[PDB]
Amino acid sequence: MIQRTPKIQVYSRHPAENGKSNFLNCYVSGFHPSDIEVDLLKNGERIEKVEHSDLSFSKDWSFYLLYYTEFTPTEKDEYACRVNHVTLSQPKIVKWDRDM
Template sequence: MHSVEVSDGGSVKRSMRFGFNGKDYISLDPDRMRWIATNHFAVMTKEEWDSDESWNNYWETQLHGIFVEHLKRYLEAGKEYFRRKVQPEVFISRREPNRQDKPLTLSCLVTGFYPVDIEVTWLRNGEVMSETQSSGVRPNHDGTHQIQKEIEINAGDEDQYSCQIEHSSLAEAQLYQWGKGLECVC
């Protein structure tokens, strides 16, 4: 397996490793062009590969040239796609407790957004609250993302809570409340 990462600043990070039987076997230090045995079975392979100049020249050309150029070409071809901004859709739902001594749950599902960076916060009368549960950001089938955050509250307090969304596709933070037609209550 090989990987090449090019940062926004232009720095390049490369890695190369081989596995065998589901386990790491040997990896390459691309800066020194030296092989690293990841277990005692790979020591002989490491010694053989370190001494094979044509083998190392091949991988140096691949990692420092060809793979980087391919990645840059792919990024250039897809730059409009990667730089796009898609506004999230927000859905707030309410789940009744399954027992009388339990609180009810408000859920804020934020979906269809791109890029991935987003802040979703529950507020009570404008004060930040800690959510009870978060799904974390997950991918959607169309290349966008979603996240769901839940908070447990006392019945009858729903109108005190709002879900705040901050995302690069939005000019400013948006607030959504249960029972307000799910329109922004900006």
């Protein structure tokens, strides 16, 4: 019964530009077992229609999922990803930095 903790990246599909439509991605990977809670946050609040890819896994059997939502970055809106898993001692929150 090996348990692996998830790796998280929060990023945009295209380079960000305020007032222009884009896609916000949360990439979760390297985790096991498969069940996982991933939410995209806008100014701390949960976005309500988030789509995710179909469960697949890497050569080491750990799973990966992409969670994405259309969004329009602004100078004032802060976006983040909240991930929780059986391996985490607390839910992990990663803020979106348009430079990473």
